Amino acid sequence: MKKILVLGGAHIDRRGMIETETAPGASNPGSWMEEAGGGGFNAARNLSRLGFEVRIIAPRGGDVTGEVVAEAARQAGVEDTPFTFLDRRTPSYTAILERDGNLVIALADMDLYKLFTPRRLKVRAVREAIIASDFLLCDANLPEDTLTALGLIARACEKPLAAIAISPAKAVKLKAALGDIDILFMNEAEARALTGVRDWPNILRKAGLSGGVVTRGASEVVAFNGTEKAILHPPLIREVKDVTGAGDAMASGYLAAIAEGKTIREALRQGAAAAAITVQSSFATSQDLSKDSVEAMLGLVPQAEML
Ligand SMILES: [Ca+2]
Ligand SMILES: [Ca+2]
Ligand SMILES: [Cl-]
Ligand code: NA
DSSP states (O other): OOEEEEESOOEEEEEEEESSSOOTTSOOOEEEEEEEEOHHHHHHHHHHHTTOEEEEEOEEESSHHHHHHHHHHHHTTOEEOOEEETTSOOOEEEEEEOTTSOEEEEEEEOGGGGGOOHHHHTSHHHHHHHHHOSEEEEETTSOHHHHHHHHHHHHHTTOOEEEEOOSHHHHGGGTTTGGGOSEEEEEHHHHHHHHOOTTHHHHHHHTTOOOEEEEETTTEEEEEOSSOEEEEOOOOTTSOSOOOOSSHHHHHHHHHHHHTTOOHHHHHHHHHHHHHHHHSSTTOOGGGOOHHHHHHHHTTSOOEEEO
């Protein structure tokens, strides 16, 4: 598996920080930091950083913010082939923070994703992107019916499909597609939401999900597939005490391991290494992900146990 196609979100993340003491409910002097984000987009960048040939299809506006996302794609080596709607704005997450980093309030405009309908997913151009790929990844930013239709296409094309849950609210959108998803990445809350730690595999398999990863807190992770499950040990003294992030990094490291054909025990430890790299300091980010950095962090990752 060399080529991964991602179908999911890619938004602008704009963060405004107040420069002085906060005046609540009023104007404050500040300055804006912008960067690209979105579960699918972040995972796409990560997979590219880990050596895969990655392409992404995300709903995109005809604006400069969309071009900022496109540029961040190119910087990470991701082929950006957007579903462009020239009259519309690229989705955005805008936060205003106090000088001390406290979140005052954030506004998400994600409506553009509603345009990615099953009808649009079914166009020849998207099917050909799928046929050109070796592995698919989606996220639950896409509409529910689109996710189900995507599952049917993956089936018909015999393409492996992975999914990122994004949030407990969004996870439920994956319910009909479950039987067509080879690996679903989620945390504790998203698992409860879609389903109704070593227990997740049998609960989830009867829900029709043949494999996935569920994370809990800083240090517990379960991975499963059609016949197997594995779990992470608590860290020893010398070992890394946080192996969980936003979710992109775990997914990317795990999926990278599976796509290279490693065991779920090995995939578990790689995903953990990848997550740990992104959270090992206040300043750590997924830009620090590479095959070499994962290789370097792996010796610090607790052992995994098949069950
Ligand atoms: Ca200023
Ligand atoms: Ca189904
Ligand atoms: Cl997102
Ligand atoms: Na964490």
